[PDB]
Design a protein around this ligand. Structure first.
Ligand SMILES: NC(=O)c1ccc[n+]([C@@H]2O[C@H](COP(=O)([O-])OP(=O)(O)OC[C@H]3O[C@@H](n4cnc5c(N)ncnc54)[C@H](O)[C@@H]3O)[C@@H](O)[C@H]2O)c1
Ligand code: NA
Ligand code: NA
Lengths: 358, 358
């Protein structure tokens, strides 16, 4: 519905710029007018709400802008006056922006985003975002868990029709999936955890500092989200057991490059844990888990039989196994769970779901 | 104020019945009014367009009605009269009703359905899926391929995003998935093809006459749908290779129930193939296949290694493997692809998409 929608983009980084390219080249019966292109420093803004005149080369326009990005209270005071429904696309991982979601929604502005923040913080924030009071903006966050795979929309659809989630488990980290798919295979191999890690870092399958992947916070925020969708009132990303791969108190002691070279000093444990699993004919994988019956959520290493689909993941795919009252046999979804184009497409897909809803 | 959508249902069988229950139970910010229900010669029609007063038990109310079922032309006329957008839900498998789809849509009546007829006939009939006219209802057929799994919506989504499907292949028949799951397994099986069908027949996991499942026509039906969505203009479900499982030229004979009793005479070929695959650590599966580059579509048996996702299916499960420009590694979606509840949930899932879009 509404043949004309205004899109307000925040974020022009790795995911953000692919998103912009996809949004600006998309052909549809619905007209999507870009009215904001904000970055940390500069920002493009249509005071008019008419489409920003950038053709398909927004980078030169943005680079040439000396207008400072508006503080969110100012941005909303402006966007709320749009003559057509507005959709905020938050392509950042900003706590600051996330902190403003509720005010966006309350001002009738919808949100499409991969930012996990607002969905993995306060439990009241969460409820406020999905209240759907009249005229308030709709909030879509498909890309928060599983990038562009059809996961969250599928869960929400299912729950709406009356189905009930009972158990979920999955590998929601592309970096950790890669590491384990390499570190623990069916074939017995004496590969060290430290070697795989720094190898992953060199190939670039890691955040600049691998510790931002090994701590499990990323996977913990995603399970917080999936758990709450499943009806488990998870308090926070740290209110349940989250097994960190960062070697014990030798953690918040080091500093980047130090951590890496210092890591090899612990391959002992994982080598022996992997061995015991190779005894029980299982492999090690890093998972996120939800159990609604027991209202128990968790993150960490778990063993999986060689037959299990988790042991045959290709590359660094993500996977979610979903058991509900109706799907007694698991619904299993695999595929890239990260990557610029695929993640931006999931966000774009969310923009399309909102555009038809408005 | 509250958005309202009137729902008109045709068919209260295994699926429709689950659909109706789910519909009357669902709680949403949008109000769905059941304004018409038709099953065989009995219909419940709210001449008022107010929600049918089915009290608690809609079955008892349907059975009590003395209102005859309206010819389709009179049904359309009546529906055009509704004060609110109407969504027709065809829970039949009728090629006759299917034949009236165009009339419904060009008259502003939307459609949600598990009925594959209209989508798997000739190509020109399929082309009539785009709102050539601005007063055209929508057409959703999610449950036509893979029950309630997120397949068709996912395919259409990424395509809109700019992605391009290159290859697809999956198990699309619940019955045939069940049969091959019993017949060809990883753990040294030994059952006769003959026996797998006879039992699937008694449990009612196959059409009253399993030949309608073995001729492979149904998967060809769903392949025609997927292939079209993928940009391959499949002429019809019989314009491409389809491997039939009804024993050689010894099908166009039997009086039907005769078939089952004479089937045990040909378990040889498949028993051989079965053994061979096992010898190779592979399993046998009946699949559908589409290749967009070569515009090649087909269905039939294929072998898969024990660790392959197509070897992890349970009972009536089915799967689809999608390789796209962005997903070099396929995203694989699996789970129940048949069954009252899950299918009805797929249809209601579409009813909800349409309602939000209206
Ligand atoms: N990189 C991946 O593979 C991947 C996979 C899934 C999800 N994500 C998520 O996608 C989002 C985008 O990540 P990314 O890789 O593009 O990060 P990035 O750092 O490359 O881009 C972030 C952008 O946000 C801008 N920004 C930050 N704070 C801002 C503010 N207050 N106002 C305006 N602009 C602001 C930055 O200037 C930058 O252009 C994050 O939420 C990330 O967690 C990333
Ligand atoms: Na996702
Ligand atoms: Na489906």
């Amino acid at each position: 519905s509404t043949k004309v929608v205004n899109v307000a983009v925040i974020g022009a980084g790795v995911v953000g710029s692919a998103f912009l390219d996809q949004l600006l080249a998309m052909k549809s019966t619905i007209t999507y007018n870009l009215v904001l292109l904000a970055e940390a420093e500069r920002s493009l803004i249509s005071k008019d709400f008419s489409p920003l005149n950038v053709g398909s080369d927004w980078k030169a326009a943005l680079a040439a802008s000396t207008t400072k990005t508006l503080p969110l209270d100012d941005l909303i005071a402006h966007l709320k006056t749009s003559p057509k429904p507005v959709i905020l696309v938050d392509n950042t991982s900003s706590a600051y922006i996330a902190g403003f979601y509720t005010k966006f929604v309350e001002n009738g502005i919808s949100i499409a985003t991969p930012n996990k923040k607002a969905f993995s913080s306060d439990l009241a924030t969460w409820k406020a975002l999905f209240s759907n009071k009249p005229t308030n903006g709709f909030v879509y966050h498909e890309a928060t868990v599983g990038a562009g795979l059809p996961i969250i929309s599928f869960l929400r659809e299912i729950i709406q029709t009356g189905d009930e989630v009972e158990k979920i488990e999955g590998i929601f980290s592309g970096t950790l999936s890669y590491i384990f798919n390499e570190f623990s295979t069916s074939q017995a191999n004496d590969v060290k955890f430290s070697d795989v890690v720094k190898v992953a870092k060199k190939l670039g399958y890691t955040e600049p500092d691998p510790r931002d992947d090994l701590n499990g916070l990323d996977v913990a925020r995603k399970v917080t989200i999936v758990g709450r969708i499943s009806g488990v009132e998870v308090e926070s990303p740290t209110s349940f057991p989250v097994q960190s791969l960062i070697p014990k108190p030798l953690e918040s002691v080091k500093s980047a490059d130090e951590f890496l070279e210092k890591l090899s000093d612990y391959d002992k444990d994982l080598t022996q844990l992997k061995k015991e699993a190779a005894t029980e004919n299982k492999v090690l994988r890093f998972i996120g888990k939800v159990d609604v019956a027991t209202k128990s959520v968790s993150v960490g290493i778990e063993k999986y039989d060689y037959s299990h689909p988790f042991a045959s993941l290709k590359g660094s795919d993500n996977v979610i196994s979903i058991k509900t009252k109706r799907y007694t046999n698991p619904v299993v979804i695999q595929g890239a769970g990260a990557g610029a184009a695929v993640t931006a497409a999931g966000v774009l897909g969310d923009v399309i779901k909102i555009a038809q809803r408005l």
